[PDB]
Amino acid sequence: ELELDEQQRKRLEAFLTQKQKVGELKDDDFEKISELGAGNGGVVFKVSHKPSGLVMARKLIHLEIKPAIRNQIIRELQVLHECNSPYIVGFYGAFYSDGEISICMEHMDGGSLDQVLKKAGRIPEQILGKVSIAVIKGLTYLREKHKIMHRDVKPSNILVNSRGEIKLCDFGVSGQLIDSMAVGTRSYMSPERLQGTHYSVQSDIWSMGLSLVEMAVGRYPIPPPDAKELELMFGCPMAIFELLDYIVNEPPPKLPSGVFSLEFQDFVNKCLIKNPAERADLKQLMVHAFIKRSDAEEVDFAGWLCSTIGLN
Ligand SMILES: O=c1[nH]ccc2cc(OC[C@@H]3CCNC3)c(Cl)cc12
């Protein structure tokens, strides 16, 4: 399931070859081009690495901390130099400079899926089929090669580009960076994680199932919509604490019927089973009818994407 085609290996090799020419990352080597997004911890800027000429995404995290803590965070982030996959955003490096930690990454010209969703209104099932494959594969890569789980799957942590690539970013790899920061939305957290119980990759499967439902209907799906709201979209206010209680206490969300295929509905239902033991695992998801159908579909994701967001 983790093997790569010719095109993937070549792109992966081309990234590392460009990366090896960068060298030590320093504050003054960066020119700000624009702001890409702002989210958990800090702001992401599209930047120019002046010496190499490489365009990168630079995430700045404002943190006032002793040289002790910052040197440990930088050392902990070095793990990301080992995470080489078509389904994971490329990492250039991390450094600290005058009150802020910088994380330099591959620039994904399509931005994140929370932004694409805002532009599209809702994302078609076939496009979501490609997103699901990429997420499952990214999570399998993290689990198999690095024995780590994502911990924060959500639309804003799924990045897309004009080449039709879909990649995960912002997975927990440093405890010290988490402690010092620490603020993140808990709205995609599985019922077991919100109950402080037994948490594995199964909790990332729930977050993926939830992100897919949001993207398919064009709305965060908790609480479920009424008969009237479903007529508005297809023709055919809760405070954060009330929402987290709703997730733990009520049946999981689901796709509306007679709008989505039964394979897509079943796929999300198997990600959203409250009990993590009954919830589908990565191995089972990889062979689910929805994945096998989406995998065999020839879907122009780059085409759909550039048309939708006006990229070009
Ligand atoms: O160009 C990408 N590379 C790495 C990270 C990244 C993060 C994205 O922004 C994430 C923010 C967080 C909440 N809204 C979107 C931007 Cl839109 C592009 C990139």
Q: Is the shortest distance between the CB of 37 and ligand 1 below 6 Å?
A: yes
**List of residues 6+ apart from 201 with CB closer than 8 A:** 139, 143, 149, 150, 281, 282
Q: Which helix (H) or strand (E) holds 38?
A: strand 30-38
The encoded tokens of residue 250 equal 């009520």
Resolution in A: 2.2
Tokens of 93: 């490096």
Integer Cα distance of 25 and 19 in angstroms: 11
Q: Is 105 in the pocket of ligand 1 (CB under 6 A)?
A: yes
37 is in an annotated binding site: yes
5 is catalytic: no
Tell me the domains of the chain and their CATH numbers. 1-109 (3.30.200.20), 110-312 (1.10.510.10)
- Cα separation, 269 vs 180, whole angstroms: 36
* Cβ of 108 below 6 Å from ligand 1: yes
Q: Which residues contact 268 (CB under 8 A, 6 or more apart)?
A: 209, 212, 213, 216, 254, 255
Q: Whose alpha carbon is nearest atom 5 of ligand 1? A: 57
Question: Can you tell me whether residue 176 is helix, strand or coil?
Answer: helix
Flag whether 181 is marked binding.
no
Please give the single-letter amino acid code of residue 309: I
Is 160 known to sit in a ligand binding site?
A: no
Angle between helices 113-120 and 301-309 (to 10 degrees): 70
Experimental technique behind these coordinates: X-ray
What does the DSSP 8-state code read for residue 28? G
Q: Tell me which of 28, 29, 109, 152 is the catalytic residue.
A: 152
Shortest-distance Cα residue to atom 9 of ligand 1: 37
